[PDB]
Structures are given as structure tokens and as C-alpha cells.
Amino acid sequence: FDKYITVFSPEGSLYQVEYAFKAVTYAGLLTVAIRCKDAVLVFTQHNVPDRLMRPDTITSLHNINKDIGTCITGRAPDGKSLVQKARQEASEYKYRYGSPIPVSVLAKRVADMAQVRTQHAGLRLMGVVMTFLGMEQNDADGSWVPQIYCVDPAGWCGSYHACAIGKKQIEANAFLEKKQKNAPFHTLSQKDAAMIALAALQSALGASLKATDVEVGRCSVEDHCFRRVPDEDVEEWLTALAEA
Amino acid sequence: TTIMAVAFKGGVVLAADSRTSTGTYVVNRASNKLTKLAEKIYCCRSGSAADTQALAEQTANYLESYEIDTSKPVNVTTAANIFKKLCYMNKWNISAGIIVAGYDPLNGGSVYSIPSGGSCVKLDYALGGSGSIFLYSFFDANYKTGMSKEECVCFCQRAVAHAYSRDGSSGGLIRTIALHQGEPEDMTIPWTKTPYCMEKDPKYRDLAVQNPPFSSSAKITVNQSRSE
Numbered sequence: 001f002d003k004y005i006t007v008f009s010p011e012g013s014l015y016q017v018e019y020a021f022k023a024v025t026y027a028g029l030l031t032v033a034i035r036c037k038d039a040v041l042v043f044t045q046h047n048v049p050d051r052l053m054r055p056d057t058i059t060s061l062h063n064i065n066k067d068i069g070t071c072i073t074g075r076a077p078d079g080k081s082l083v084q085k086a087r088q089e090a091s092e093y094k095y096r097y098g099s100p101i102p103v104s105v106l107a108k109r110v111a112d113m114a115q116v117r118t119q120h121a122g123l124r125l126m127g128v129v130m131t132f133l134g135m136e137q138n139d140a141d142g143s144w145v146p147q148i149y150c151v152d153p154a155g156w157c158g159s160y161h162a163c164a165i166g167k168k169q170i171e172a173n174a175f176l177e178k179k180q181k182n183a184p185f186h187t188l189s190q191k192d193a194a195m196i197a198l199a200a201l202q203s204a205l206g207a208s209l210k211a212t213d214v215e216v217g218r219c220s221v222e223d224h225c226f227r228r229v230p231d232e233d234v235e236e237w238l239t240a241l242a243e244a
Numbered sequence: 245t246t247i248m249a250v251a252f253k254g255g256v257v258l259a260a261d262s263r264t265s266t267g268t269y270v271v272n273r274a275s276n277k278l279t280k281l282a283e284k285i286y287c288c289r290s291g292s293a294a295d296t297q298a299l300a301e302q303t304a305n306y307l308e309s310y311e312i313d314t315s316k317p318v319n320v321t322t323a324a325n326i327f328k329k330l331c332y333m334n335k336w337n338i339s340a341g342i343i344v345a346g347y348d349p350l351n352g353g354s355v356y357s358i359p360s361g362g363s364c365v366k367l368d369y370a371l372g373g374s375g376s377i378f379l380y381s382f383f384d385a386n387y388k389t390g391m392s393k394e395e396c397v398c399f400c401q402r403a404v405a406h407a408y409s410r411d412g413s414s415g416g417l418i419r420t421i422a423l424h425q426g427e428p429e430d431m432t433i434p435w436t437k438t439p440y441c442m443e444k445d446p447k448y449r450d451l452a453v454q455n456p457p458f459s460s461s462a463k464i465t466v467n468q469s470r471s472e
Contacts, residue, residue, distance in 0.1 A: 063312055091309050095301075 005121050016125055017118055020153040023127025024074040025167050031060070031073045032172060032200055033131055033148050034162040036185055036193035039220040040133050040146035041229075042071050043197050045166075045205075046215045061217045061228065065090050067134055068103050069217050069226030073165045074128035082130055086110055103134035107149035107157050115155030125153050129165050133217065135224050144221055161185050164200060172204035190220075194237040195244075211235045246375030246407040246414045247277060247288035249345040250387075251368050252396040255353040255424030256345045258286055259400040261375070261408050262416035264293060273416045278430075282307050284423050285323050285346030290373040291339035291360075299340065303327045319348040324356040324364060332362025341372045347423045375407035375414045382406055393422055401433060405440040 002009040006016055031044040048055045060072045060079075064086050072079030089109050093101040110130060117125050130151045135144045148160045162185055164172035179196050188196075202209055216229040249258045260277040263270055277289050279300045285307075289296035303326050311318050324344045331340055342358040357370040368389065371379050382403055391399065401418055408414040418433040433439075442448050457468040 063315075065308075065312060087309070087312060091305060094308075095305055 006118055014118060014154075017154050020125040020127045023078075024129055024153075024165070025169075026127075027074050027076070028167050029060070029073065030164065030166040030168060030172065030201060030204060031071055031131065032162070032164045032176075032197045033071070033133065033160070034176075034185060034193050034197045035146050035148055035160075036188040036190055038146075038222070039190055039193075039218055040135075040148055041190070041194060041197060042069070042131065042133055042217045043194075043201060043214050044071055044073070044216075045201070046213055055212070059215060061215060063226055064106065064132070065100060067100060067219070067224050067226060068106060069133045069219065071131045071133075071217065072128055073131070075126070078126040079128040079130065082110065082113075082126055082128065085113060086130075102136055103132055103147050104136060104149060104159075107132050107151055111151045111155050111157035114151065114153060118153075118155060127153060129153075131163070131165065133219055133226060135219050135221070144224065146219060146221075162197070164204070168204040172200045175200045175203050191237060191240065195241045198238060198241055209238060211238065245277065245290040245373035246379075246404055246411065247290055247341075247343060247372045248376075248379070248400060248403065249288060249343050249355045249370050250391075250396055250400055251353045251355050251389075252391050252393055255347050255393065255422060256355055257393075257396045257400050257420060257422050258288055258343070258345055259404050259418065259420045260288055261404060261414040262419060263408075263414055265413055268412075270415070276419060278419055278421055280304070281323050281344070282311070282318055282346070284348065284428065285318070285320055285344070286421060286423065287327070287345070288343040288372065290341040295338040295340050296342070299327065299330050299334075299338075299342075302330060317348065319350055320344065320346040320354040320356070321351070324358070324366075328358050328362060328364040331358050335360070335362050343370045343372055345370075345423070347425065349425070353424070373414070375404075375411040378407045378410050379403055393424065397422060397431070402439050405438045409440060409442050 003015050006014060009015060029045045029047060033042040044060045048058055062070050062083050064070055070083060086106065090101045090106060117123050132149045134147060136147050137144050148163065149157060150160060150163055151157050162176050164176065185193060198209065211231040211234045214234060216234055217226060218229050219226050245261065247260045249256055258278050262274050264272040264275045279287050279289055281287055281300065281304050287300055289300065303323065306326055307318050307323055327342060327344055331342060341360055344358065345355045347353050355367050355370050357365045357367055369383065369387065397420055400420060404418045416435060421428055421430045451467060453464055453467055455467045456464050
């Protein structure tokens with residue numbers, strides 16, 4: 001009964017929330033995000049099993065507006081419904097206050113959408129983790145700083161230096177923890193950050209990657225916009241890793 | 245107000261004056277009536293400042309959403325259609341004449357006119373505002389298709405100067421923007437460097453003879469300048 005709707009079990013837990021988190025791994029893909037000195041990057045597996053599928057129509061990355069990107073991990077159509085609600089939110093904010101929504105504010109608004117379904121009966125929770133990426137401005141000096149914020153099915157909202165989500169996330173997080181001990185990720189260049197993210201994917205999947213197996217997104221101090229990184233730029237990061 | 249847009253080979257030029265007034269007093273002498281709707285699409289606004297600011301902002305909001313949903317840059321015809329619908333649904337409660345103009349790679353440079361009443365007409369040039377009435381004849385005599393971008397900027401600057409020298413409700417700066425496949429180019433001419441005004445035209449230097457001195461003849465000569 002506690003297994004079927006949002007009420008508490010006797011130990012204080014919510015089972016539909018636990019099960020919505022297994023939906024995140026059931027989908028079978030892995031994502032990694034990392035923030036370095038001047039940028040934020042996100043690397044997700046591009047799976048095109050069927051040889052007849054048109055690869056440029058399958059994506060886990062989307063723009064919310066010009067300057068904010070998302071990566072969906074988990075049940076794919078659930079994630080597309082949250083992309084549409086986030087788009088609507090960012091456009092209401094701009095009408096009301098006359099400026100584009102900051103990435104920390106947007107993440108909190110989507111986290112509230114999720115919490116409402118853990119507390120009202122009759123609508124299914126969405127079985128996804130949404131990762132949001134963007135640059136944010138300081139009020140002191142006016143300089144811009146990259147951010148990563150993740151939102152989970154319970155309505156939790158949090159910021160990271162780097163994060164792995166999906167199948168074998170436990171092993172990929174362990175891996176990034178080790179690498180962090182050498183140098184904090186905010187001192188690293190793009191290339192060094194990228195070599196750590198690609199090495200973590202490979203280590204956890206237990207395989208070798210070509211450029212066509214990963215899709216990558218980026219925002220930077222140089223160009224605020226969220227943009228897909230070209231396959232040629234990724235090849236050269238993988239080449240650089242294969243050497244060392 | 246004097247606004248206009250003209251097509252050229254591969255784009256458009258928009259132009260305006262900078263005055264906002266309550267009839268006989270100037271509240272702002274440096275308004276900006278060329279309003280951005282998307283990277284390469286602008287409108288020109290005439291009538292009630294409050295109404296045109298509000299409908300431009302709403303049209304821009306809808307174009308930004310559309311562009312994110314399709315992942316492509318929008319066409320001029322889509323901006324004109326959205327704007328037309330807002331002007332037509334609210335026609336009894338607003339005072340607005342709009343011109344929408346811009347560049348897109350499907351149709352090139354395009355100009356649309358949306359006058360009071362909410363009609364939508366696709367043209368080679370459009371005029372609007374109180375000052376337009378002074379320019380119908382200027383274009384009928386001196387406008388040609390196929391001008392270059394620099395010809396067209398110069399022509400529109402001259403056209404705006406002629407209208408504002410005769411219309412009391414127009415004046416101040418001339419603002420222009422040119423939209424084509426490259427980057428947008430804005431320009432502001434100050435009144436002191438205007439290409440035409442009555443005050444510096446030599447055929448209006450000498451004063452009319454209205455006040456001739458008391459004389460023994462009916463011949464009219466000069467105005468009296470000193471007491472007898």
C-alpha cells in the first residue's frame with residue numbers, strides 16, 4: 001500500500017521514490033560532468049544499437065535557453081517532459097523580471113515540480129536525473145563562473161565539482177574521487193579535465209571509446225552559450241589519453 | 245514620428261527619428277524606436293509608446309521560445325504573422341503602426357507593414373508615423389530598386405531629414421540599422437550633422453518682406469531694421 005502510492009512506510013521512507021531511482025539505472029547508460037577553471041563539460045554515451053537508426057536524431061542533451069543546457073539520464077520520455085516544463089519556466093521568468101533565468105534558480109524550480117509529486121497522490125514520479133549546466137555571474141566583480149546542478153526524483157537539488165550518473169555510477173564516482181586528490185578540478189585546463197572524464201567512462205564501461213560513442217556539451221568563460229562540441233575536438237582528447 | 249524600412253539587394257535598412265512628445269512639449273529627445281525582435285529581425289514603432297513597447301516585448305518572447313524548440317533561426321514572415329495577430333486582436337484598445345523587417349536565408353531581405361486595423365502587407369518599402377505624409381512624393385520621385393547597402397543607408401538618412409524639417413512632431417537624432425547575412429550595423433547621426441534642414445538651406449536665408457518702412461511710394465523693398 002505504501003508500495004503503490006506516496007505515503008510513508010513505518011520506517012519513515014517513500015518506496016515510490018526509491019523505485020523511481022532504479023528507473024535511472026535500468027535505462028543502461030552513463031553520464032559524467034566536470035567543471036574546470038574556465039568551463040563546464042558534459043560527456044554522455046550515444047547509443048545507437050540499431051544500424052537503421054539515424055544517429056543525429058538520438059540525443060540526451062538539450063538547450064533550455066541559449067545559455068543553459070541539460071543532460072537527461074534515465075527514462076527518456078520522462079526526461080523530455082521535464083525539458084518542456086523547464087523551457088516554459090525559463091520563459092515565464094524572463095517575461096516577469098525582464099532578464100534570463102540563472103541556472104541555480106531554474107534547478108530549484110524544477111526540483112519543486114518533483115517534490116509536488118512525492119506529496120500528492122495519482123501522478124507518477126519522473127524516473128530521471130536532470131543535470132543543468134551554465135555560467136553564473138558574481139555580484140562583487142561581475143566575473144562569470146561555471147556551474148553544475150543535478151536534480152533527482154525526490155526533489156533534491158545540489159551542486160558538484162564533478163558527477164557521474166547512471167549504470168556503474170558507483171565505480172565511476174570512486175574513480176573521480178581518486179583523481180581529485182591530485183589536483184582540485186577548478187585548477188585544471190579543459191584538456192586535463194576531459195582526460196579525467198573520458199578515462200572514468202572507459203574504466204566503468206570496461207571498453208574503448210570512439211568519438212561517435214560519446215556526445216559532449218560545453219559552456220565557457222570565452223563563449224557563454226551551451227554548445228555541442230565537434231567530433232574532431234573530442235577525437236584529439238581521446239588520442240591524447242591513449243598516449244598517456 | 246517618422247519611421248521607414250527599405251529593401252536592398254540582399255537585405256534591409258530601417259530608419260527613424262528620436263523624438264517623443266505630448267503634443268507641443270518634448271519629453272524625450274533621444275528615444276530609440278528601432279526595437280530588436282531576434283538577431284536579424286527588427287521592428288519600427290509608431291503611436292502609443294506604452295502599447296508598442298508591450299506588444300514588441302510579447303512578440304520577442306514568443307520568437308525566442310520558437311527558436312529553441314526548432315533549433316533554427318526564425319524567418320521574417322513568422323515574426324510578421326505573430327505581430328499582426330496581436331495588433332488585430334487588440335485593435336479597439338491600442339494606437340499602433342508597426343513595420344517588421346529583417347533578413348533570413350530563405351527569402352533574403354523582407355519588409356512587412358502592419359498599419360492601424362491590423363492588416364499585413366508585404367512590400368519593397370514602407371513608411372509610417374505622422375511624418376510619412378511628407379515622404380510619399382520624395383520616394384515616388386527618387387527611389388529605385390537594386391540600390392547597394394551604402395546607397396540605401398544614405399537615401400534613408402536624407403528621407404528622414406526631409407520629413408523632420410517639416411513635421412513638428414519629429415526631430416532629434418537619425419538612427420539607422422542595416423540587416424543582411426553579415427553582422428548588424430547601427431548608426432546615429434546628430435542634428436548638427438543632418439544632411440538637410442531648412443535653417444541652412446540658402447533659399448530660406450533671406451527673410452520675407454512683411455514689415456516695410458513708412459514711405460512715399462508703393463514699391464516694396466526691404467524690412468525696417470531700425471527706429472526712425
